[PDB]
Amino acid sequence: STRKAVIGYYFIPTNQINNYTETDTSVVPFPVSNITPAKAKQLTHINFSFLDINSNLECAWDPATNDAKARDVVNRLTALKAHNPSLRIMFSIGGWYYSNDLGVSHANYVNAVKTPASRAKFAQSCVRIMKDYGFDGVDIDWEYPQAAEVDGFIAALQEIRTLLNQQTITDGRQALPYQLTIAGAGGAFFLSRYYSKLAQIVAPLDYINLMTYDLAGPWEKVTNHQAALFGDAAGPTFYNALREANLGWSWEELTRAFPSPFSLTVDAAVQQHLMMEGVPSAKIVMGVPFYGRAFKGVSGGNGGQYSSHSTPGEDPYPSTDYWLVGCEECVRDKDPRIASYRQLEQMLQGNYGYQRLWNDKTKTPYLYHAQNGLFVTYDDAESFKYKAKYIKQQQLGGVMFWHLGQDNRNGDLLAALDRYFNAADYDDSQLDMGTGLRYTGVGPGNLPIMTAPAYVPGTTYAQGALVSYQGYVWQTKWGYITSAPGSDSAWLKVGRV
Numbered sequence: 028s029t030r031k032a033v034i035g036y037y038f039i040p041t042n043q044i045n046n047y048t049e050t051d052t053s054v055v056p057f058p059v060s061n062i063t064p065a066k067a068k069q070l071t072h073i074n075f076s077f078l079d080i081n082s083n084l085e086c087a088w089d090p091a092t093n094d095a096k097a098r099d100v101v102n103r104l105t106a107l108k109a110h111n112p113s114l115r116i117m118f119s120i121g122g123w124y125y126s127n128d129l130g131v132s133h134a135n136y137v138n139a140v141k142t143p144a145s146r147a148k149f150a151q152s153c154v155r156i157m158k159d160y161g162f163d164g165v166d167i168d169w170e171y172p173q174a175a176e177v178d179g180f181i182a183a184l185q186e187i188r189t190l191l192n193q194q195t196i197t198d199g200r201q202a203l204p205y206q207l208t209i210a211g212a213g214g215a216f217f218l219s220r221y222y223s224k225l226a227q228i229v230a231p232l233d234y235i236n237l238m239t240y241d242l243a244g245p246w247e248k249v250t251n252h253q254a255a256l257f258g259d260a261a262g263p264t265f266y267n268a269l270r271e272a273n274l275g276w277s278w279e280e281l282t283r284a285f286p287s288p289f290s291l292t293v294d295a296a297v298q299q300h301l302m303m304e305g306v307p308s309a310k311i312v313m314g315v316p317f318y319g320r321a322f323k324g325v326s327g328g329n330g331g332q333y334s335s336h337s338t339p340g341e342d343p344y345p346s347t348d349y350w351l352v353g354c355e356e357c358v359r360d361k362d363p364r365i366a367s368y369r370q371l372e373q374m375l376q377g378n379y380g381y382q383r384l385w386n387d388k389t390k391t392p393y394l395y396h397a398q399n400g401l402f403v404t405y406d407d408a409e410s411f412k413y414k415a416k417y418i419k420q421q422q423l424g425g426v427m428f429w430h431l432g433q434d435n436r437n438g439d440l441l442a443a444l445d446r447y448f449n450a451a452d453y454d455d456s457q458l459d460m461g462t463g464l465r466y467t468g469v470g471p472g473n474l475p476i477m478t479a480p481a482y483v484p485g486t487t488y489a490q491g492a493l494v495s496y497q498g499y500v501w502q503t504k505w506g507y508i509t510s511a512p513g514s515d516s517a518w519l520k521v522g523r524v
């Protein structure tokens with residue numbers, strides 16, 4: 028079996044690069060030296076983040092970056108390749124801060140993909156930056172191009188692919204080609220922006236890393252799991268934005284591919300991607316979070332799940348009240364709404380009042396502070412057993428995560444992921460995926476194999492008539508159909524032969 032990708036983000040703020048040190052945790056919490064040889068071997072990719080697209084419409088580091096210190100940090104990462112011949116140090120362009128619709132550099136993203144000339148100049152800058160700093164690939168994290176910017180985004184990706192494939196030949200990297208990936212939406216709302224052209228977006232990529240997290244948060248009215256694998260009927264449900272994408276499909280087609288409302292889960296994002304033709308499962312990578320989201324002012328009854336709350340949803344945290352008991356990291360980061368798994372693990376074992384609970388439908392853990400009314404949704408080594416089994420069962424390309432500095436000091440989360448995919452003595456054949464809700468949509472990309480008597484010319488077909496014909500099973504949408512399946516909108520293609 029081909030090894031599953033394990034893609035971890037290495038994120039460092041500009042000021043940390045400008046004051047990089049591997050000997051003062053109060054200045055650089057997570058220096059490159061914390062990525063021991065053992066951890067380097069459990070990773071296949073490290074996404075260095077984040078670079079941006081400047082006003083000159085080229086890939087570039089934050090202008091305030093001390094270049095020499097930046098190269099030194101990157102060199103330290105590249106040196107880890109000594110312990111793992113498959114390791115690739117990618118760099119990520121974008122991220123929410125720089126590129127969301129209201130982010131500071133949004134216009135640059137829109138403008139860089141606008142014309143053949145802007146695209147050429149942009150694609151060149153990505154490869155140049157890649158070669159100059161010694162990176163092994165380009166990862167684009169634009170959150171997210173809108174419907175009109177999509178064809179341009181696609182041309183940009185194709186252009187970068189062309190240049191990278193050329194660079195691979197020029198550098199003798201046939202054995203470890205340069206790669207191209209993007210962080211893709213892991214939720215229908217953002218996904219609906221480019222969904223209709225998913226095949227063209229994925230074609231030039233080695234992997235599309237789904238951000239299947241942040242699926243719940245203080246901006247929503249009711250608390251919920253931010254990365255549930257499957258759905259919980261007792262949990263909130265959402266409008267399936269995909270049924271409104273510019274697909275050109277019929278009512279029937281739209282309805283059967285996009286049930287609404289539905290459970291916003293990791294399984295939903297993966298299955299929605301697999302519903303489209305030309306989106307190979309092997310390129311789909313499941314993103315997981317090494318952090319949890321916290322809410323205050325929750326009620327009792329369901330251990331804090333599906334409750335109203337009083338947590339501010341704006342960025343930055345519009346207050347100075349650090350109410351996440353025991354979360355020291357939250358005080359230094361001035362935000363009690365997010366906490367690394369490292370910090371959560373310490374809070375859990377420090378007698379702070381948290382009770383760890385488990386939702387066996389969503390297959391994810393959660394914390395409930397009954398005394399203060401706090402709820403935290405997060406992921407751990409146990410939820411990763413199911414996600415890892417799903418990744419194997421669905422034949423996905425692998426896993427991705429944000430971010431390395433949030434794992435505990437022993438790197439247990441990374442180690443668990445590596446174990447679930449590669450340990451010869453780990454056996455998950457008896458691991459039960461449970462009865463949580465699965466995404467029920469069916470599209471052109473995942474039609475099931477079926478059998479039905481073959482269409483007989485001359486027969487009058489009633490409503491709901493199933494006849495195999497031309498390599499597909501077709502069903503009539505209404506009665507008195509006497510036409511051949513395929514050239515009358517009265518027929519619905521429902522299966523493969």
Ligand SMILES: CC(=O)N[C@@H]1[C@@H](O)[C@H](O[C@@H]2O[C@H](CO)[C@@H](O)[C@H](O)[C@H]2NC(C)=O)[C@@H](CO)O[C@H]1O
Binds near residue numbers: 124242244341342
């Ligand atoms: C599933 C979905 O579409 N949820 C949206 C949220 O993602 C989004 O919140 C923002 O998400 C970013 C990561 O995707 C965070 O970096 C950011 O902190 C977070 N909060 C913000 C920007 O206020 C919200 C708001 O755009 O919309 C949801 O629909």
Ligand SMILES: CC1=[NH+][C@H]2[C@@H](O1)O[C@H](CO)[C@@H](O)[C@@H]2O
Binds near residue numbers: 036076123210429
């Ligand atoms: C590569 C990546 N870009 C996004 C995403 O993963 O999730 C992170 C966690 O919310 C967020 O900080 C970042 O902007």
